[PDB]
Amino acid sequence: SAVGEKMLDDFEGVLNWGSYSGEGAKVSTKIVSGKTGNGMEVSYTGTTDGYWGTVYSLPDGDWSKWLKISFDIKSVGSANEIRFMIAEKSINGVGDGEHWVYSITPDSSWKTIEIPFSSFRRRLDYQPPGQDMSGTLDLDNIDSIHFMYANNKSGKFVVDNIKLIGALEHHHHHH
Numbered sequence: 001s002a003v004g005e006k007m008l009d010d011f012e013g014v015l016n017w018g019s020y021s022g023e024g025a026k027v028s029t030k031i032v033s034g035k036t037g038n039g040m041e042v043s044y045t046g047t048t049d050g051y052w053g054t055v056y057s058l059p060d061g062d063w064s065k066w067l068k069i070s071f072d073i074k075s076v077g078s079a080n081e082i083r084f085m086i087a088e089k090s091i092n093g094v095g096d097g098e099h100w101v102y103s104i105t106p107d108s109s110w111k112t113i114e115i116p117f118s119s120f121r122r123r124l125d126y127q128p129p130g131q132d133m134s135g136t137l138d139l140d141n142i143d144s145i146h147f148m149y150a151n152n153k154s155g156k157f158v159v160d161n162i163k164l165i166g167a168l169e170h171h172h173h174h175h
């Protein structure tokens with residue numbers, strides 16, 4: 001495993017995040033003040049059968065050396081659950097692959113959320129047509145990360161410092 005961290009998005013550079021929604025649900029994103037420097041504010045309106053998310057399609061899909069993913073989050077509002085999702089790459093050259101999720105509820109102060117990869121759960125409400133149906137998160141085959149709906153409610157939150165986390169230090173190995 002790698003030691004240290006690897007920044008995926010500190011929100012100080014290119015705008016990496018695309019928005020999608022349907023069935024009456026909506027999301028919009030913008031750059032705002034973050035935890036350090038700038039961050040991305042996500043404003044969403046849920047609906048009963050609708051969906052929304054914001055997505056970063058990653059240029060490097062091999063996360064096998066790392067242990068956790070971390071980000072800072074804060075609500076801007078009534079507390080409301082969302083999901084952070086990792087999608088594998090598709091088995092058929094189009095769309096995405098297997099969806100893996102973890103639920104988070106932004107609150108009124110900045111919090112760093114570190115999620116071990118082994119804590120992600122296989123998404124139960126939906127899988128895309130190009131999923132591998134492996135029931136294991138394949139860290140050498142990552143397509144994208146998302147902040148997306150959990151429910152039919154509305155809210156506003158800000159994220160910053162999306163990064164991979166490895167081992168804490170290089171330590172001496174026993175023989």
Ligand SMILES: *[C@@]1(O[C@@H]2[C@@H](O)[C@H](O)O[C@H](CO)[C@H]2O)O[C@H](CO)[C@@H](O[C@@H]2O[C@H](CO)[C@@H](O[C@@H]3O[C@H](CO)[C@@H](O)[C@H](O)[C@H]3O)[C@H](O)[C@H]2O)[C@H](O)[C@H]1O
Pocket residue numbers: 018020021022023049050051055056057095096125126128143144
């Ligand atoms: C979206 O596509 C992204 C693409 O725009 C971008 O170019 O590349 C990235 C990275 O590869 C893509 O992520 O991908 C998301 C995640 O797979 C799609 O979201 C799913 O959309 C389906 C509908 O197409 C939706 O299913 C509906 O869910 C509702 C609510 O539960 C249900 O009532 C409906 O019956 C379902 O059809 C899933 O919930 C979403 O995750 C998005 O559509 C793409 O644009």
Ligand SMILES: [Ca+2]
Pocket residue numbers: 010011012034035036037038039160161
């Ligand atoms: Ca920042």
Ligand SMILES: [Ca+2]
Pocket residue numbers: 088098132133134135136137138
């Ligand atoms: Ca898989």
